[PDB]
Amino acid sequence: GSATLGRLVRAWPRRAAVVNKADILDEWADYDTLVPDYPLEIVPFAEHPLFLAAEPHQRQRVLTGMWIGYNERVIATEQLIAEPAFDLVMHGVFPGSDDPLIRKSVQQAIVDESFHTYMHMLAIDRTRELRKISERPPQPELVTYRRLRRVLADMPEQWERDIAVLVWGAVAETCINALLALLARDATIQPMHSLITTLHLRDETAHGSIVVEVVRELYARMNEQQRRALVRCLPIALEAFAEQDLSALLLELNAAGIRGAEEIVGDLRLVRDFSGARKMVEQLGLDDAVDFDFPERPDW
Amino acid sequence: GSATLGRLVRAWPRRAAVVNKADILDEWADYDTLVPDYPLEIVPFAEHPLFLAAEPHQRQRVLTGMWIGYNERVIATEQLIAEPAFDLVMHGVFPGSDDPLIRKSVQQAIVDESFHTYMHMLAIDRTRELRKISERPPQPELVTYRRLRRVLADMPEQWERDIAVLVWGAVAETCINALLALLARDATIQPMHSLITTLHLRDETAHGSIVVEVVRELYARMNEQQRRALVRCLPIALEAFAEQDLSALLLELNAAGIRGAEEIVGDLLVRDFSGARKMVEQLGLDDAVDFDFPERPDW
Fold first, then answer.
1. What's the first-to-final CA gap in chain B, in angstroms?
2. How many folded domains does chain B comprise?
3. Which domain holds residue B88?
4. In CATH, what number is assigned to the domain containing residue B107?
5. Which positions in chain B touch A103 (Cβ < 8 Å)?
């Protein structure tokens, strides 16, 4: 079997966030209210005159809101997109998925996603308590999940729905959110915010390598119509993860009471790193068969 | 907020198997094939004449099968019974489940169950490799799960189905498998077999405490007709976890080639219900539940 997979399975105890920082709760120990929740430098409208025209506490409420929103979207992605793909592999629904090495690598990833959900859930609860955020509008559906559900809606056959779910999860796990990596390195924000994202990023880098190996092995064992289906679905999943939907920004800005929120939003790097998914496409020998313009590899 | 829930949440990093023995895979290192997989002492037909009249390799193959069978059932219980109940709580379908202390304790439990599945899956894989078992017959559907399907068939509405799933999960997590506890303490079997079960039991002791606290809190917030279904639901789940089904024994004796397997099973390990009894008290359902709780086992 895959030496990459063997190596990833062996490294998991030395690498995983759940093993090496299970005590994340205690990181709020000596909290400092004076330190921001989110870095202004990665806010796209940070220097828009209408955002600058606001009062300092209003800008701070937007930053806090964007931090909470980012954590909400991470949890929804894990729960609705990434974990269901991992679960399908473990269920043995694809030929070749009964392999001990595939099963070990993916079950480890499932433990990691559980702990990721734990960390991000903690981040929301602690922030809401400490910032005294009593109430907050029930946020919109993920654009990525909306696309998934619409693809699946009129699909007759379970075998094809399984392919779509796998591909959506695979793309999610190989296309790293710019906010994950930018938040991870940021020294200006709450140290627990930088830390949680640092931990998640370390695990996600391994998850992308696992997904590349696992998808190669399963595609190789798939029949032609399964293979064909995987191929059609890739560009659709890739475009869903490339698509920016700034509905969340509008709600945050309106929440904070910033005047001209519609103007600021309507007025509008932060691209995902698609390196992993490009490697995935390469490993499948699909380097000319996928209709997607891959963005440049980010500096970070 | 519950002081028990609070203590268990803050102790989780020190307690959790996932933190303490993530490298469980490496425990197979200096592997000794001479050490049995499973203790004869706890095999219900160990002293049956037809079992004793089989060859040494045949009896050792049964022990291997029962160990693998144990692990298969643990995984199935976690996947089909325990995790769904915990997920239901996290999906906030019940009033009062949005509480951050409840969410922390249950999410930590969910991390634990994913790691338990991992441990048990690898015990199966490492045993099958080292003992050279190339094929194993399809296993029977869990008795507990078969009974679950039945109740859900009888109670088909979405809101009914949530309550049944929760109770099924709750009973599973508060009634400790005799085999879990007896394997954990066994000094004669493969050290990693007693280790995995020791680790799982340590976690499960906490989970039982968690479930009693959570279910109580969720009980307070249900409407008349939800409470109704939960109270009527408890004894059926409890009966399900108490009913002893012999079908998996008859399969190990065949997988091993033992003659008169039917007679053996014809001629034929009660859970510790202590945690579930407490759950019943905590709900004030002491007089309401028609179920006869067995005496606590010494272990």
1. 31
2. 1
3. 1-299
4. 1.10.620.20
5. 121, 125
